[PDB]
Tab-separated table of C-alpha atoms and ligand atoms in Angstrom:
chain	number	residue	atom	x	y	z
A	5	UNK	CA	-33.069	17.929	16.676
A	6	UNK	CA	-35.522	15.754	18.562
A	7	UNK	CA	-33.428	12.441	16.931
A	8	UNK	CA	-30.196	14.031	18.075
A	9	UNK	CA	-32.038	14.324	21.737
A	10	UNK	CA	-33.097	10.793	21.669
A	11	UNK	CA	-29.799	9.443	20.256
A	12	UNK	CA	-27.914	11.030	23.151
A	13	UNK	CA	-30.354	10.501	25.871
A	14	UNK	CA	-31.673	7.105	25.376
A	15	UNK	CA	-28.215	4.619	25.548
A	16	UNK	CA	-26.474	2.735	22.811
A	17	UNK	CA	-28.359	-0.156	21.861
A	18	UNK	CA	-26.558	-3.577	22.186
A	19	UNK	CA	-25.683	-4.303	18.443
A	20	UNK	CA	-26.682	-7.734	18.861
A	21	UNK	CA	-30.090	-6.132	19.284
A	22	UNK	CA	-30.263	-5.231	15.838
A	23	UNK	CA	-30.525	-8.474	14.197
A	24	UNK	CA	-29.446	-12.058	15.194
A	25	UNK	CA	-27.298	-12.258	12.267
A	26	UNK	CA	-25.942	-8.444	12.360
A	27	UNK	CA	-22.173	-9.542	12.215
A	28	UNK	CA	-22.281	-12.159	9.705
A	29	UNK	CA	-20.798	-11.722	6.113
A	30	UNK	CA	-24.413	-12.997	5.054
A	31	UNK	CA	-26.552	-10.125	6.694
A	32	UNK	CA	-27.824	-7.340	4.577
A	33	UNK	CA	-27.543	-3.994	5.902
A	34	UNK	CA	-29.734	-2.692	3.073
A	35	UNK	CA	-32.759	-4.727	5.729
A	36	UNK	CA	-31.948	-2.035	7.838
A	37	UNK	CA	-34.966	0.819	8.354
A	38	UNK	CA	-33.246	3.929	7.542
A	39	UNK	CA	-34.466	5.694	10.650
A	40	UNK	CA	-32.529	2.904	12.548
A	41	UNK	CA	-29.233	3.054	10.891
A	42	UNK	CA	-27.869	6.098	12.679
A	43	UNK	CA	-28.221	4.167	16.025
A	44	UNK	CA	-26.590	1.342	14.410
A	45	UNK	CA	-23.510	3.337	13.485
A	46	UNK	CA	-23.154	4.125	17.440
A	47	UNK	CA	-23.640	0.398	18.381
A	48	UNK	CA	-20.989	-0.876	16.117
A	49	UNK	CA	-18.532	2.349	16.870
A	50	UNK	CA	-18.977	0.883	20.816
A	51	UNK	CA	-18.614	-2.859	20.235
A	52	UNK	CA	-15.451	-1.757	18.161
A	53	UNK	CA	-14.473	0.230	21.168
A	54	UNK	CA	-13.853	3.421	19.790
A	55	UNK	CA	-16.175	5.558	21.666
A	56	UNK	CA	-14.122	4.549	24.947
A	57	UNK	CA	-10.952	4.069	23.256
A	58	UNK	CA	-10.303	7.481	22.078
A	59	UNK	CA	-12.824	9.096	24.581
A	60	UNK	CA	-15.061	10.143	22.059
A	61	UNK	CA	-17.775	12.868	23.599
A	62	UNK	CA	-21.518	11.318	23.341
A	63	UNK	CA	-22.945	14.608	22.283
A	64	UNK	CA	-20.516	15.469	19.635
A	65	UNK	CA	-20.386	11.911	18.291
A	66	UNK	CA	-24.569	12.181	18.101
A	67	UNK	CA	-24.234	15.505	16.263
A	68	UNK	CA	-21.853	14.232	14.055
A	69	UNK	CA	-23.350	10.770	13.108
A	70	UNK	CA	-26.686	13.425	12.371
A	71	UNK	CA	-24.711	15.241	10.272
A	72	UNK	CA	-23.220	12.883	8.210
A	73	UNK	CA	-26.344	11.578	7.319
A	74	UNK	CA	-27.997	14.495	6.349
A	75	UNK	CA	-24.763	15.271	4.447
A	76	UNK	CA	-26.340	12.463	1.743
A	77	UNK	CA	-28.575	13.463	-1.034
A	78	UNK	CA	-30.946	10.763	-2.713
A	79	UNK	CA	-29.776	9.802	-6.158
A	80	UNK	CA	-30.828	6.165	-6.854
A	81	UNK	CA	-27.463	4.411	-5.556
A	82	UNK	CA	-25.245	7.173	-3.710
A	83	UNK	CA	-27.442	7.699	-0.762
A	84	UNK	CA	-26.922	7.380	2.990
A	85	UNK	CA	-28.243	3.528	2.424
A	86	UNK	CA	-25.317	3.221	0.278
A	87	UNK	CA	-22.836	4.898	3.165
A	88	UNK	CA	-24.374	2.907	6.016
A	89	UNK	CA	-24.163	-0.365	4.051
A	90	UNK	CA	-20.297	0.029	3.286
A	91	UNK	CA	-19.818	1.112	6.899
A	92	UNK	CA	-21.435	-1.950	7.919
A	93	UNK	CA	-19.210	-3.993	5.856
A	94	UNK	CA	-15.948	-2.146	7.523
A	95	UNK	CA	-17.807	-3.542	10.801
A	96	UNK	CA	-17.613	-6.904	9.208
A	97	UNK	CA	-14.177	-6.931	8.125
A	98	UNK	CA	-13.142	-5.809	11.774
A	99	UNK	CA	-15.591	-8.939	13.551
A	100	UNK	CA	-14.453	-11.847	10.882
A	101	UNK	CA	-11.293	-10.886	9.778
A	102	UNK	CA	-8.390	-9.967	12.934
A	103	UNK	CA	-7.405	-6.589	11.169
A	104	UNK	CA	-5.545	-5.997	14.550
A	105	UNK	CA	-3.272	-8.295	13.575
A	106	UNK	CA	-2.594	-6.088	10.407
A	107	UNK	CA	-3.730	-2.272	10.867
A	108	UNK	CA	-3.021	0.024	14.070
A	109	UNK	CA	-6.356	1.079	15.983
A	110	UNK	CA	-6.188	4.533	14.501
A	111	UNK	CA	-6.198	3.290	10.996
A	112	UNK	CA	-8.984	1.090	11.993
A	113	UNK	CA	-11.366	3.816	13.103
A	114	UNK	CA	-10.106	6.278	10.219
A	115	UNK	CA	-11.598	3.281	7.597
A	116	UNK	CA	-14.712	3.100	9.520
A	117	UNK	CA	-15.474	6.946	9.762
A	118	UNK	CA	-13.967	7.322	5.827
A	119	UNK	CA	-16.337	4.427	4.915
A	120	UNK	CA	-19.357	6.845	6.720
A	121	UNK	CA	-18.242	10.025	4.795
A	122	UNK	CA	-16.869	8.604	1.672
A	123	UNK	CA	-19.755	9.782	-0.793
A	124	UNK	CA	-20.659	12.797	1.043
A	125	UNK	CA	-23.078	15.033	-1.307
A	126	UNK	CA	-22.763	13.195	-4.109
A	127	UNK	CA	-25.121	14.428	-6.580
A	128	UNK	CA	-25.108	10.779	-9.098
A	129	UNK	CA	-22.872	11.847	-11.778
A	130	UNK	CA	-19.532	10.932	-11.980
A	131	UNK	CA	-15.868	12.518	-12.131
A	132	UNK	CA	-16.335	12.436	-16.120
A	133	UNK	CA	-19.690	14.492	-15.862
A	134	UNK	CA	-17.932	17.135	-13.362
A	135	UNK	CA	-15.184	18.116	-16.216
A	136	UNK	CA	-17.521	17.556	-19.132
A	137	UNK	CA	-20.426	19.918	-17.524
A	138	UNK	CA	-18.123	22.504	-15.910
A	139	UNK	CA	-19.516	22.146	-12.650
A	140	UNK	CA	-18.062	24.185	-9.816
A	141	UNK	CA	-16.294	20.909	-8.526
A	142	UNK	CA	-14.008	20.345	-11.558
A	143	UNK	CA	-13.358	24.133	-11.029
A	144	UNK	CA	-12.102	23.424	-7.660
A	145	UNK	CA	-10.346	19.990	-7.956
A	146	UNK	CA	-9.790	18.895	-12.033
A	147	UNK	CA	-6.146	19.754	-12.200
A	148	UNK	CA	-5.894	17.365	-9.161
A	149	UNK	CA	-8.292	14.530	-10.461
A	150	UNK	CA	-10.476	12.358	-8.310
A	151	UNK	CA	-12.782	15.534	-8.468
A	152	UNK	CA	-15.874	13.886	-6.898
A	153	UNK	CA	-13.536	12.222	-3.795
A	154	UNK	CA	-11.844	15.575	-2.982
A	155	UNK	CA	-15.273	16.829	-2.889
A	156	UNK	CA	-16.567	13.901	-0.547
A	157	UNK	CA	-13.289	14.281	1.734
A	158	UNK	CA	-13.895	18.891	2.021
A	159	UNK	CA	-17.284	17.376	2.809
A	160	UNK	CA	-16.080	15.085	6.288
A	161	UNK	CA	-13.568	18.021	6.942
A	162	UNK	CA	-16.678	20.985	7.030
A	163	UNK	CA	-18.752	18.824	9.565
A	164	UNK	CA	-15.798	17.999	11.273
A	165	UNK	CA	-15.350	21.827	11.541
A	166	UNK	CA	-18.761	22.822	12.468
A	167	UNK	CA	-19.129	23.377	15.986
A	168	UNK	CA	-20.456	20.675	18.018
A	169	UNK	CA	-19.351	17.918	15.507
A	170	UNK	CA	-15.835	17.567	15.896
A	171	UNK	CA	-15.372	14.311	17.627
A	172	UNK	CA	-11.462	14.439	17.379
A	173	UNK	CA	-10.887	17.905	18.866
A	174	UNK	CA	-9.544	16.337	21.936
A	175	UNK	CA	-6.973	14.492	19.810
A	176	UNK	CA	-3.188	15.301	20.284
A	177	UNK	CA	-1.799	17.614	17.261
A	178	UNK	CA	-0.123	14.733	15.887
A	179	UNK	CA	-3.048	12.588	16.221
A	180	UNK	CA	-5.732	14.887	14.940
A	181	UNK	CA	-3.182	15.188	11.291
A	182	UNK	CA	-2.846	11.482	11.243
A	183	UNK	CA	-6.741	10.797	11.440
A	184	UNK	CA	-7.095	13.853	8.765
A	185	UNK	CA	-4.446	12.552	6.625
A	186	UNK	CA	-5.723	9.086	6.865
A	187	UNK	CA	-9.270	9.918	5.744
A	188	UNK	CA	-7.842	11.951	2.777
A	189	UNK	CA	-6.045	8.823	1.477
A	190	UNK	CA	-8.614	6.498	2.358
A	191	UNK	CA	-11.552	8.515	0.594
A	192	UNK	CA	-9.324	9.154	-2.499
A	193	UNK	CA	-8.920	5.437	-2.625
A	194	UNK	CA	-12.673	5.346	-3.743
A	195	UNK	CA	-11.896	6.785	-7.124
A	196	UNK	CA	-11.874	3.354	-8.880
A	197	UNK	CA	-9.175	4.938	-11.535
A	198	UNK	CA	-6.735	4.945	-8.142
A	199	UNK	CA	-7.678	1.348	-7.517
A	200	UNK	CA	-6.706	0.668	-11.133
A	201	UNK	CA	-3.555	2.334	-10.887
A	202	UNK	CA	-2.277	0.470	-7.663
A	203	UNK	CA	-3.773	-3.272	-8.670
A	204	UNK	CA	0.153	-4.481	-9.609
A	205	UNK	CA	0.901	-2.786	-6.241
A	206	UNK	CA	-1.588	-4.757	-4.371
A	207	UNK	CA	-0.715	-7.908	-6.013
A	208	UNK	CA	2.718	-7.421	-5.338
A	209	UNK	CA	1.887	-7.009	-1.550
A	210	UNK	CA	-0.142	-10.559	-1.768
A	211	UNK	CA	2.741	-12.190	-3.147
A	212	UNK	CA	5.422	-11.509	-1.333
A	213	UNK	CA	3.282	-11.296	1.874
A	214	UNK	CA	1.719	-8.358	4.316
A	215	UNK	CA	5.032	-7.027	6.124
A	216	UNK	CA	3.183	-5.243	8.864
A	217	UNK	CA	6.344	-3.441	9.864
A	218	UNK	CA	6.217	-1.600	6.194
A	219	UNK	CA	4.406	1.652	6.196
A	220	UNK	CA	3.315	1.150	2.454
A	221	UNK	CA	1.826	-2.005	3.309
A	222	UNK	CA	-0.426	-0.564	5.604
A	223	UNK	CA	-1.700	2.311	3.207
A	224	UNK	CA	-2.101	-0.618	0.375
A	225	UNK	CA	-3.960	-2.456	3.101
A	226	UNK	CA	-5.988	0.617	3.914
A	227	UNK	CA	-6.824	1.085	-0.141
A	228	UNK	CA	-7.874	-2.872	-0.701
A	229	UNK	CA	-10.261	-2.630	2.635
A	230	UNK	CA	-12.039	0.445	1.733
A	231	UNK	CA	-12.875	-0.605	-2.262
A	232	UNK	CA	-13.686	-4.005	-0.531
A	233	UNK	CA	-16.277	-2.015	1.657
A	234	UNK	CA	-17.374	0.369	-1.514
A	235	UNK	CA	-18.125	-2.873	-3.870
A	236	UNK	CA	-19.752	-5.080	-1.389
A	237	UNK	CA	-23.013	-4.799	-2.309
A	238	UNK	CA	-21.724	-7.399	-4.651
A	239	UNK	CA	-20.825	-10.015	-1.955
A	240	UNK	CA	-24.501	-10.758	-0.905
A	241	UNK	CA	-27.298	-12.805	-2.417
A	242	UNK	CA	-28.584	-12.671	-5.845
A	243	UNK	CA	-31.659	-10.372	-4.791
A	244	UNK	CA	-29.416	-7.701	-3.630
A	245	UNK	CA	-27.361	-7.916	-6.950
A	246	UNK	CA	-30.252	-7.752	-8.872
A	247	UNK	CA	-31.740	-4.466	-6.944
A	248	UNK	CA	-27.949	-2.725	-6.752
A	249	UNK	CA	-27.950	-3.116	-10.756
A	250	UNK	CA	-31.475	-1.516	-11.177
A	251	UNK	CA	-30.295	1.628	-8.918
A	252	UNK	CA	-26.970	1.718	-10.357
A	253	UNK	CA	-28.090	1.785	-13.693
A	254	UNK	CA	-30.795	4.472	-12.743
A	255	UNK	CA	-27.953	6.497	-11.674
A	256	UNK	CA	-25.864	6.226	-14.708
A	257	UNK	CA	-28.921	6.486	-17.383
A	258	UNK	CA	-29.721	9.643	-15.718
A	259	UNK	CA	-26.337	10.995	-16.297
A	260	UNK	CA	-26.293	9.630	-20.166
A	261	UNK	CA	-29.262	11.401	-20.798
A	262	UNK	CA	-27.906	14.751	-19.448
A	263	UNK	CA	-25.126	14.075	-21.031
A	264	UNK	CA	-27.021	13.666	-24.719
A	265	UNK	CA	-29.032	16.784	-23.330
A	266	UNK	CA	-25.883	18.668	-23.493
A	267	UNK	CA	-24.410	17.183	-27.016
A	268	UNK	CA	-22.368	14.527	-25.620
A	269	UNK	CA	-21.795	11.072	-26.641
A	270	UNK	CA	-22.230	9.047	-23.378
A	271	UNK	CA	-19.896	6.039	-22.451
A	272	UNK	CA	-22.140	2.587	-23.470
A	273	UNK	CA	-22.596	1.962	-19.568
A	274	UNK	CA	-24.574	5.119	-19.222
A	275	UNK	CA	-26.833	5.415	-22.478
A	276	UNK	CA	-29.985	3.466	-22.244
A	277	UNK	CA	-30.253	3.004	-25.683
A	278	UNK	CA	-26.852	0.815	-25.945
A	279	UNK	CA	-26.547	-0.459	-22.475
A	280	UNK	CA	-27.013	-4.389	-21.964
A	281	UNK	CA	-26.887	-4.706	-18.535
A	282	UNK	CA	-26.139	-8.531	-18.496
A	283	UNK	CA	-23.042	-8.043	-19.930
A	284	UNK	CA	-21.731	-4.505	-18.151
A	285	UNK	CA	-22.464	-6.349	-15.057
A	286	UNK	CA	-20.433	-9.364	-15.949
A	287	UNK	CA	-17.267	-6.942	-17.167
A	288	UNK	CA	-17.512	-4.951	-14.064
A	289	UNK	CA	-17.410	-8.225	-11.958
A	290	UNK	CA	-14.934	-10.212	-13.910
A	291	UNK	CA	-12.528	-7.097	-14.493
A	292	UNK	CA	-12.905	-5.185	-11.028
A	293	UNK	CA	-15.268	-7.046	-8.502
A	294	UNK	CA	-13.643	-10.289	-8.755
A	295	UNK	CA	-10.155	-9.575	-8.734
A	296	UNK	CA	-10.586	-7.346	-5.713
A	297	UNK	CA	-11.962	-9.999	-3.439
A	298	UNK	CA	-9.613	-12.467	-4.794
A	299	UNK	CA	-6.508	-10.514	-3.158
A	300	UNK	CA	-8.814	-10.002	-0.299
A	301	UNK	CA	-8.944	-13.827	-0.123
A	302	UNK	CA	-5.317	-14.219	-0.624
A	303	UNK	CA	-4.593	-11.726	2.483
A	304	UNK	CA	-6.969	-13.173	4.792
A	305	UNK	CA	-8.093	-16.706	3.839
A	306	UNK	CA	-11.432	-16.150	5.796
A	307	UNK	CA	-12.774	-13.892	3.596
A	308	UNK	CA	-12.890	-16.781	0.946
A	309	UNK	CA	-16.709	-16.635	0.889
A	310	UNK	CA	-16.839	-13.489	-0.293
A	311	UNK	CA	-14.935	-13.691	-3.515
A	312	UNK	CA	-17.313	-17.111	-3.977
A	313	UNK	CA	-20.060	-14.911	-3.450
A	314	UNK	CA	-18.952	-12.725	-6.175
A	315	UNK	CA	-17.976	-15.624	-8.618
A	316	UNK	CA	-21.657	-16.925	-8.002
A	317	UNK	CA	-23.347	-13.857	-8.548
A	318	UNK	CA	-21.710	-13.526	-11.956
A	319	UNK	CA	-22.647	-16.659	-12.799
A	320	UNK	CA	-25.944	-15.876	-12.216
A	321	UNK	CA	-25.987	-12.568	-14.493
A	322	UNK	CA	-24.907	-15.135	-17.631
A	323	UNK	CA	-27.693	-17.936	-16.338
A	324	UNK	CA	-30.415	-15.038	-16.604
A	325	UNK	CA	-29.088	-13.108	-19.776
A	326	UNK	CA	-31.522	-15.082	-22.080
A	327	UNK	CA	-34.501	-13.409	-20.375
A	328	UNK	CA	-33.245	-10.156	-21.770
A	329	UNK	CA	-34.228	-11.384	-25.204
A	330	UNK	CA	-37.937	-10.890	-26.042
A	331	UNK	CA	-39.279	-14.594	-26.821
A	332	UNK	CA	-42.773	-14.566	-28.503
A	333	UNK	CA	-44.860	-11.477	-27.874
A	334	UNK	CA	-45.084	-9.090	-24.929
A	335	UNK	CA	-47.352	-9.616	-22.165
A	336	UNK	CA	-49.604	-7.474	-24.022
A	337	UNK	CA	-49.420	-9.200	-27.021
A	338	UNK	CA	-48.644	-6.201	-28.884
A	339	UNK	CA	-45.928	-5.099	-31.113
A	340	UNK	CA	-46.350	-1.533	-30.740
A	341	UNK	CA	-43.479	-1.296	-29.122
A	342	UNK	CA	-41.581	-1.652	-32.558
B	401	IBM	C1	-21.205	2.765	-7.861
B	401	IBM	C2	-19.869	2.537	-9.516
B	401	IBM	C3	-18.836	3.692	-9.153
B	401	IBM	C4	-19.270	1.058	-9.061
B	401	IBM	N1	-19.895	-0.024	-9.344
B	401	IBM	C5	-20.310	-0.539	-8.436
B	401	IBM	O1	-19.824	-0.139	-7.414
B	401	IBM	N2	-20.947	-1.701	-8.428
B	401	IBM	C6	-21.717	-2.350	-6.962
B	401	IBM	C7	-21.496	-2.059	-9.610
B	401	IBM	O2	-22.151	-3.234	-9.775
B	401	IBM	C8	-21.267	-1.538	-10.858
B	401	IBM	N3	-21.604	-1.604	-12.086
B	401	IBM	C9	-20.860	-0.673	-12.690
B	401	IBM	N4	-19.970	0.040	-11.613
B	401	IBM	C10	-20.675	-0.505	-10.394
B	402	MG	MG1	-17.539	7.406	-4.442
B	403	ZN	ZN1	-19.581	4.787	-2.281
């Protein structure tokens, strides 16, 4: 409540005061201290003109931002700093790519709020684990698929439906229904099985050319953009790539350990006794990340540097892999580890 009081009564800090490089593809939002991130979200919403444009109520918006923040747990990767960094990449796409030539204002606003909300209440395990472990979330949503994503979305809606937090409640019935439908489509798009299912449709869009009058093209493009935000850690420097891999694998291997403990054999990527990080990272980059940024470049020539960073981070894993083989003796001069 004291954070609220300051967020409401102090004023929204100019977005340029956050960092000289804040609106650049090269800025690493993970550099921002966590206690500074809710005010940075208000600064970005202001700079995108959404607060004025949609006449969002200030007290309601401050409550909503804090509630969203408080709705993340602290697994190594799927925490509020990941949501905050995804949301920042949305802001980057807006500042560096002329989205307004492709998407409706309301679409762009929904993509940004969906980025804030898209992993709410994640417990550091994936859809497969929900099913295998017979979790309450699979009881609710296993028949439809995308279990966690449905739960993120439901969590977002629960926040809006909390007294004092409905940032859309003055909207017309038509616009409110549109915003919530968009949030559903965008947050369900973050299931990488969904991205893989629509991949051919994305390629076909890129090849024939984006048609702004085509409602299906809008929908495909929001999916690609949301994916591109959710994987944007791979578009920074090598120090970020390396640190994100440490967090992702800590989280995956915790899951693998639970799976072992219930008698299931984990995916190789989830088993700490089998996973070979360089090879796993290179596969993720070649098979998932680079094709996404290449499609982004195809649609938006000014996105080319993102695809180039991902390709360079990929080359970097090949360059360091040799270090994963123990040459000589360990530092302690001991083979006790054997
Ligand atoms: C978090 C996970 C579902 C997807 N994912 C990811 O987003 N990044 C950035 C990776 O490097 C990665 N490696 C495997 N999965 C990965
Ligand atoms: Mg997710
Ligand atoms: Zn995410």
